[PDB]
């Protein structure tokens, strides 16, 4: 692969990236709930 | 769904990480500015009425 | 049709080129940037490296704050609406204080306070860039011609935004930050002072501005015409005059009866460009302070017909 | 008299017309067929200007002014005192400028250099002919051309400009100005950089083009190079004059109103024309 | 200060404009005398000093100090041709052309002229040979554009003169400066890159007929080119535009 | 259907995924802006009416 | 093969690309159903 | 009609597939934009009346 | 989450710390200027009215 | 290692100092927000 | 906090002291200019009123 | 031992004087704010 | 505080003395400019009233 | 140990002179501020 990474490295890398994305998504989901409770857009 | 990690064999994480970082910021700012310009959703002008700060 | 040497036919790329050291404090120089194949058709392909250091950081931070202060005022004038911001982008304007405030710093933030704050960051950014232009030459042991050339442009810019407002007695005389508004200012300035065409230093400034297009067309065409003899390598033609420099000299001697040298044409070049903003700055400094109607001044000085 | 290196270059040939009939020099000046043509038109045009000064009744060189025919004369001939001298001097100017370019082509051939110089000069000729010939012919009257007078041609610039409001709003005029200012910036920088290398600090050796590359990369993170800068200075100058000619050929032929009103097409794009706030809302 | 005159109409804007005319006359005198550091004093066509030297005097000498130990240049200075010139007068009067007495391409006169430049390579800032064959600079490669190496070289007579075997690159400037052409006797020549058209299937050299390529002055070292050699090559090729007959 | 995967032997997935990312994002931006421009679908303006939030 | 991808590399990489396409297009359909339930265009 | 496969010997498949992709997008978008430009087929405004969404 | 520190194997922390500092400062300056532009939240004006410092 | 040249040991310590800066900065930001909210609620 | 000193192991001390000096100067001037631009806090115009000087 | 070539001890030496300077500057600033607050409260 | 001198092994006195000399001069001129622009403190104009040299 | 190539003792000498120049400058500065305050208070 054209990043030179071994597969082992890409698996390691993806686990950190997705854990960051799950954390970011969790805060966003709460933020939309709080705003929808505060002031629904539907 | 399991094999997605092989995307990091294709793109340099430095480039992707910076690119998604700039994307998320510029998208978030754009949305907050759409809301501040929307009178029904500008929280600063809402709370000004709710607490009669307009006087 | 033959090759004109306007775009390159073949690009070669070696290693990255880090450039001369001399007395450059090499810790302050970045890594080399990427190569651009697009730029390589017309000039060099290599981007970077760049030198930062102390006057660099000062200039870049103050220049960022100048730009950011104007931008936020434009976002406010847009009412934070991203669509209106792009519709009216050329119509936004950060105006100087109103005339009643004179030179006092007491104008409200919306009535000219942000223009003073913006103008302060511009002042520091430009002057620290001047010292940076001096010191980068010093570190390489070069002459200071570039810093003294830049001082001529600063002279006009200082007259427009600082000196003439002080001598006129109000910041309302200064230029607003905005695309169409500095154009409206430029037009209004000429109308208030009675047609700036009849300012003789605006006439001179235009002569040197046309002369700069004349002279760079002549010089650029000359060097490309002799580039088949390596005439673009002008420093080696100064040190060791080749047939390129002689053919260039004889073209103009046979055309117009006199000629430059490879070193001396760059003195014509620097002065032709420097005199644009030197005479310009004088012509603005005289406007309103010494002459309030240039057309009538022209009539008294034998350049317009009397009534 | 010759430059000390000049003699080896004064060979016969390269003439486009006339062979060896005019293949000689007069002092430094090369003559040739078009040098004869050039001097005739130049002398005639100058002398008809001095005669127009007699008809006008001034000897102050700053008041001398040769006006084109009034609009009532259309594109036809006018009386000599009343526009006909301007027409002949315009013929002489065109004859002189074109002959001068063609004389430069001959000098290029004799020296074996590229034709870049006469080609670049031909852009100035086309800007001149735009203002005195092509645009007046499109608009239908010689009176839309500018008068030959040091200050009176500035009245033409003023009166032509303010016919369309503030002329800063002509979008091609804005582009031309941007090239004119950028050209003058680049000429200041190029002159200074070459001089700063050839004339270093006292006692130091001459700097190399490596120092020139290094200074600008240190200053701005890029360096166009020895060849790039001369390409740039040429193309910036020529682009400035191309967009200058373009801005005028459209003015009074396809655009007639205040140029400031043109920019409303952007403001009135229908996805944002009605959105409240800003300057236009 | 508005309207304030010392005398007549002479206000402070009059003082400015008159002061500028004095400065401009001084600056123009400075600029022209600076431009007399090469090619002066003026000569008669025989080479004797011309009785008319013009209105400006020669400037005082300046000395340039050359890098890499190559000495110092003083200008203006003694400035002989330092070579033979194979020209003869075509008239007794001054101002007429001088005709080539033999073969002007090989005698190096007119548009074929060349100058007695230093017989050493031009150097970069470190003091390496500035121009090298690309094979001798290992990082270099053709990064875009039609690679000419391996193309046949065609003359203006439309016949093949040889093939391109290398590019000679300017190292600091990172640009292609000559094409090396291998002739039909296997000896090579340098062609100036600005004199050739790299077409899709050929390199076209509009200055030379295919027979004239053998006359190109050859370099003495196969790995470097001196400034004298460059001038001889570049002069010879450009001379062909006048002197290559059909 | 079975052979469409040979597209990856023709186009290098790096260039494809960048071009596809730009394409899909700008297409979504087109549609949302068309809907915000549309009185029957501008969700912020609809919500304002439904909850009386304006004037 | 212009990209140098072996047949097995192309048969692998396509399978992951398709997996993402089906996931993305599925989520889009859920979004369309919800917005149709909110406000039918047809 | 059998020999239409010969096209791939003459035109590089990458440089054709790019040309087809751009072409099909432009044609589709042009038609949808024309349809929205006619009230007869503007599916948003047909729906607005049908469901009484602006009254 | 525990592996987040491996970001410093990907990015030179000098460049991240410089970039982060100017990001934070510009963001904070923008928010304060938004609130000063907001009449209900301009603390300099709020105190002026509270203490009758104008008129 | 990775792309920079930091090791696992170096990076894992640097990150702890970075996060010590993050939480300290964030804690003051919480105090600032709560003080402003008690003074002048924006909801 | 005990290891904040390792900032000096990663950043050159001159660049930090310059960058922080530059920052504090520009910030301090900006705030004084904001207060001079504020009618209720311009100390010169305040004292001018307090002592019936021309203001 | 780090990128800068400063040792772990030189980095502690310089940090000790940096904090000595920071605390002095902020102490004077705190006094300046308190004086201005007593003169003319902004809250 | 007793090691505030340690700065001179870090920063060159030639750079520091010039930089500070330029700074202090411009700060002083800036303040005299601010006061001369203020009618309550223009000492030349104050004297014109105090001694009635005006008119 | 250092960037400038001053010695630790040369630094102390120069600093002792620098500080004395600062104190002489600021001493005059106080006298000027106090004089202007006595002449025309700004608070
Ligand atoms: C609105 C602003 C404009 C603004 C206009 C633009 C202003 C900004 C640009 C300034 C450019 C400066 C020009 C310059 O450096 O001149 C010195 C240089 C030195 O050349 P040289 O070769 O080293 O020495 C002279 C001599 O050895 C040359 O050879 P030779 O003697 O065999 O032949 C003589 C030449 C021409 O020489 C002359 O005409 C006499 C010297 C002129 C000096 C001009 C400056 C100083 C005196 C100015 C006041 C002289 C008062 C009498 O060839 C011939 O004579 C052959 C016949 C053709 C020429 C016929 C001319 C007919 C008479 C027309 C009037 C000419 C007036 C100069 O070249 C010359 O002498 C000849 C120049 C001929 C073209 C000059 C064009 C520039 C404008 C006029 C001169 C500058 C003053 C404004
Ligand atoms: C109705 C309009 C008026 C008029 C009103 C004015 C006024 C008013 C002025 C001019 C001036 C000029 N006019 Mg006029 N002018 C008119 C008609 C003309 C015509 C014409 C064909 O009709 C022409 C050719 C000109 C030509 C010119 C120029 C010769 C001259 C500006 C020189 C220059 O370089 O400025 C451009 C250069 C600068 C402004 C210097 C800038 C330097 C600074 C330091 C740059 C800072 C950069 C900043 C920090 C951004 C950085 C970004 C980077 C990416 C980091 N005018 C008519 C009569 N004109 C000026 C002058 O000098 O008058 C005598 C001037 O002030
Ligand atoms: C002699 C007359 C001519 C002249 C000369 C001239 N100008 C000059 C020079 C010379 C000789 C220089 O040496 C100097 C130069 O450096 O040129 C390359 C300069 C220069 N002339 C300039 C412009 C200019 N010159 C002009 C004109 C002229 N210049 C005349 C024609 C004009 C116009 C209108 O005609 C302009 C606009 C600049 C290119 C340059 C001076 C640069 C300068 O002072 O910049 C100050 C601002 C900054 C350093 C930064 C601004 C903000 C940036 C966006 C950087 C942001 C960085 C930040 C870290 C980003 C962070 C983002 C976060 C969100 C992450
Ligand atoms: C295209 C880019 C720029 C350019 C390029 C350029 N000009 C050039 C060249 C080049 C490359 C030449 O080779 C050529 C030259 O030889 O330069 C020394 C030239 C030249 N550019 C000149 C001038 C010039 N260039 C200008 C502009 C520009 N030149 C462009 C901006 C301008 C203005 C106003 O912008 C002027 C005045 C000359 C120095 C020269 C051409 C000389 C020539 O033609 O000589 C033969 C003719 C005469 C000696 C006299 C003719 C007399 C007439 C018959 C009578 C006068 C009529 C005229 C209309 C009167 C006008 C009165 C004014 C007050 C309006
Ligand atoms: C063996 C050869 C046989 C040849 C046979 C004869 C052929 C003769 C016809 C020639 C055809 C082309 C003529 C041009 C187009 C035309 O019809 O024009 C007719 C118009 C008349 O329009 C008139 O009418 C115009 C309207 S209209 O065009 O009729 O609709 C109107 O706008 C204008 O005001 C009015 O004057 O006149 C012109 O356009 C003027 C021609 C000018 C030529 C000399 C220029 C001298 C002045 C100074 C400029 C010098 C420039 C120097 C350049 C080197
Ligand atoms: C009034 O309104 C209008 C103006 C719009 C009126 C109409 C105007 C007009 C003139 C319209 C014309 C329309 C035309 C010309 C339409 C043509 C459409 C075409 C050309 C459609 C083609 C589609 C083809 C497709 C989708 C092909 C896909 C191919 C795929 C997926 C596989 C590609 C192959 C491989 C991956 C195999 C590779 C093999 C190896 C060995 C590596
Ligand atoms: C108002 O109406 C309009 C004007 C808007 C009408 C518009 C009409 C129109 C022209 C619409 C066009 C729409 C089109 C053409 C849409 C196409 C969409 C597509 C093709 C979407 C595809 C999405 C694919 C995704 C999300 C794939 C993701 C893949 C992932 C996550 C896996 C990545 C990982 C790997 C491949 C592993 C790598 C493997 C190895 C071996 C290294
Ligand atoms: C203005 O908007 C409208 C009104 C017009 C509506 C339409 C707007 C629109 C079209 C929105 C579309 C939004 C989209 C496409 C959003 C996509 C968001 C994404 C892709 C978010 C991803 C976030 C990912 C995050 C936060 C990941 C963080 C990863 C972290 C923290 C860890 C990184 C990994 C490492 C440090 C690796 C360590 C391991 C090794 C081996 C070194
Ligand atoms: C550059 O790269 C690195 C990696 C090095 C990052 C560096 C990041 C860094 C360390 C930044 C440091 C930032 C610092 C030091 C931030 C400090 C912030 C502070 C201390 C903020 C304080 C804010 C306080 C506020 C907003 C308080 C507001 C209070 C209000 C509005 C109400 C007050 C009410 C009354 C006075 C009324 C009742 C009482 C009385 C007496 C009447
Ligand atoms: C009014 O609102 C708007 C309309 C403008 C809308 C704004 C909405 C919006 C999009 C806001 C976005 C905000 C975001 C994305 C904020 C993110 C902030 C972050 C990422 C903050 C991070 C702070 C981190 C700090 C302060 C860390 C400091 C670290 C320090 C001081 C230590 C650094 C480490 C070392 C010295 C390493 C030492 C060890 C060794 C071995 C060298
Ligand atoms: C529009 O927005 C508003 C302006 C209204 C609000 C903006 C709010 C905002 C974003 C504020 C941000 C504030 C921050 C981040 C402040 C940080 C301050 C810090 C970290 C200050 C540290 C200062 C340290 C000092 C002054 C001293 C150090 C001393 C040292 C290292 C000893 C060595 C120095 C010497 C011996 C001095 C030698 C002499 C000279 C003249 C250099
Ligand atoms: C995307 O949104 C963001 C917010 C992120 C960025 C938006 C960026 C944006 C839209 C920027 C817009 C910038 C524009 C349109 C700038 C226009 C500038 C122009 C045309 C300037 C023209 C002339 C300026 C002159 C002549 C200024 C001279 C100033 C001088 C000489 C400084 C004099 C100094 C003072 C008066 C200050 C004195 C103060 C003290 C304290 C002594
Ligand atoms: Fe040059």
From Swiss-Prot, chain C:
Binding site for (7R,8Z)-bacteriochlorophyll b: 182, 202
GO MF annotation terms: bacteriochlorophyll binding; electron transporter, transferring electrons within the cyclic electron transport pathway of photosynthesis activity; metal ion binding
Binding site for Fe cation: 219, 234, 266
Family: Belongs to the reaction center PufL/M/PsbA/D family.
Protein localization: Cellular chromatophore membrane
InterPro entries in the cross-refs: Photo_II_D1/D2_sf (IPR036854), Photo_RC_L/M (IPR000484), Photo_RC_L/M_CS (IPR055265), Photo_RC_M (IPR005781)
Cross-referenced SUPFAM superfamilies: Bacterial photosystem II reaction centre, L and M subunits
Membrane spanning residue stretches: 53-79, 110-139, 142-167, 197-225, 259-285
GO cellular component, as recorded: plasma membrane light-harvesting complex; plasma membrane-derived chromatophore membrane
GO biological process, one term: photosynthetic electron transport in photosystem II
Name of encoding gene: pufM
Subunit structure: Reaction center is composed of four bacteriochlorophylls, two bacteriopheophytins, two ubiquinones, one iron, and three highly hydrophobic polypeptide chains (designated L, M, and H).
Organism lineage string: Bacteria, Pseudomonadati, Pseudomonadota, Alphaproteobacteria, Rhodobacterales
Key words of the record: Bacteriochlorophyll, Chlorophyll, Chromophore, Electron transport, Iron, Magnesium, Membrane, Metal-binding, Photosynthesis, Reaction center, Transmembrane, Transmembrane helix, Transport
Statement: the UniProt record of this protein carries the keyword Transmembrane: yes
Keyword Thylakoid: no
Pfam name, any one: Photo_RC
Protein role: The reaction center is a membrane-bound complex that mediates the initial photochemical event in the electron transfer process of photosynthesis.
This protein's name: Reaction center protein M chain
Organism of this sequence: Cereibacter sphaeroides (strain ATCC 17023 / DSM 158 / JCM 6121 / CCUG 31486 / LMG 2827 / NBRC 12203 / NCIMB 8253 / ATH 2.4.1.) (Rhodobacter sphaeroides)
Membrane topology: Multi-pass membrane protein
Binding site for a ubiquinone: 252
Record-linked NCBIfam families: pufM
